[PDB]
Each structure stands twice: as C-alpha cells, then as structure tokens.
C-alpha cells in the first residue's frame, strides 16, 4: 500500500521505459480475457469459407440442413454486417 507506491515513484523517476513496457505487457496479457469482442473474432474466423462446402446426401430426416443457399435454414451472418 505504501511500499509499492514509493517503488513505482522511484521506477518512474529513473526508468520510465521499463515502467511503460511492463504496463503495456500487463495490459496485453490481461485485457483479452475480459473482453466481449474476443468471442466475435473467433466467430469471424469461423465464417470465412476457405474451402468448398461439400453438400450432404439428403437422407430424408435432415430438417435443419438447407436445400438451397437462400433457404432460411443454416447458419446466418446477419450479426456480422451489423458489426
């Protein structure tokens, strides 16, 4: 409570570069785990279609699978355009 304050004052007076680098590194470590957008990035990386979506053989009991790209079934990217 009082030792750390004096240490920080002395470090800022003598080695401001080290204080700045340690603060930036600590923020870089901590903040990603507290952010709501970190999930979104993953979702974006999951929405990028690098390879061909191979169609499935319709066995007759596949309701949630679309039959045409414009059919309402399947994943939606509406959350992405509004972002």
């Amino acid at each position: 409570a009082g030792r750390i304050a004096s240490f920080l004052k002395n470090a800022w007076a003598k080695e401001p570069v080290l204080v700045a680098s340690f603060a930036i590194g600590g923020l870089a470590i901590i903040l990603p785990s507290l952010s709501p957008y970190t999930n979104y990035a993953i979702r974006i990386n999951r929405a990028t279609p690098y390879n061909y979506p191979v169609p499935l053989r319709d066995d007759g009991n596949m309701p949630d699978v679309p039959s045409h790209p414009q059919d309402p079934q399947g994943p939606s990217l509406e959350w992405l355009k509004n972002l």
């Binding site: 061909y52 191979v54 169609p55 499935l56 053989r57 045409h68 790209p69 414009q70």
Partner: protein
C-alpha cells in the same frame, strides 16, 4: 497390374462456357443462386465417387445449366451486365468493391426482368 480405363474423346465433348474470368465473377452470385441444384449434384458425385470418370454426365449438366443462365442474361439485359464486368475486368485483383454502381444497375435489371 491392369489397364487404366479411360473415356473416349467423344464422351469428353461438351458445349464450352467460353466467357472470361471477370465475366464469371460478375455473374458469380446470381449464377450460384440459380444453377445450384445441378452444381451440388455434381459436387456430391465428385466427393462421393472420388473418380472424375464416374461423374462426366453431371459435369455436362453443369455446363448446360451455365449456358442456360448466360443465355437468359444476354437475352434480357446484356448492356447493364457488360458495363458491370468491364469495370470489374479493369481491376488487377478484380474487386467487387470498386464497381458498386455498375453492380446496382445489373442487380436492378435482373430483379425486374427475371
């Protein structure tokens, strides 16, 4: 260990789709929307049989459906489409981003024509 079976040159004959890459990219979205059923049938065949010799007839229907699609575009509004792919062709990366006005003109033609 055996002779490799090959199709004859005649079985490999088909009416070619002789449009260029920028022309294909200008019509790519509507083409994927309209000719989806034969395309998906051919891709399911291709990924299930693991052999190009077993899905020639589906590839022929893919070509035929693309010909019908392009036949409809030329018959209804070739002008608006031609201004769109020409603008797309100029870009070295063939970017959708640089031709949004031409794309709008083409989309609004095909919305009421077809």
């Amino acid at each position: 260990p055996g002779i490799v079976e090959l199709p004859t040159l005649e079985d490999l004959k088909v009416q070619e789709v002789k449009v260029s890459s920028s022309v294909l990219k200008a019509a790519a979205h509507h083409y994927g929307a309209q000719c989806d059923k034969p395309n998906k049938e051919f891709m399911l065949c291709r990924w299930e049989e693991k052999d190009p010799r077993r899905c020639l007839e589906e590839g022929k229907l893919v070509n035929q459906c693309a010909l019908d699609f392009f036949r409809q575009i030329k018959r209804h509004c070739a002008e608006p489409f031609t201004e769109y792919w020409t603008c797309i062709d100029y870009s070295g990366l063939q970017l959708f981003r640089h031709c949004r006005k031409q794309q709008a003109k083409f989309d609004e033609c095909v919305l009421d024509k077809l």
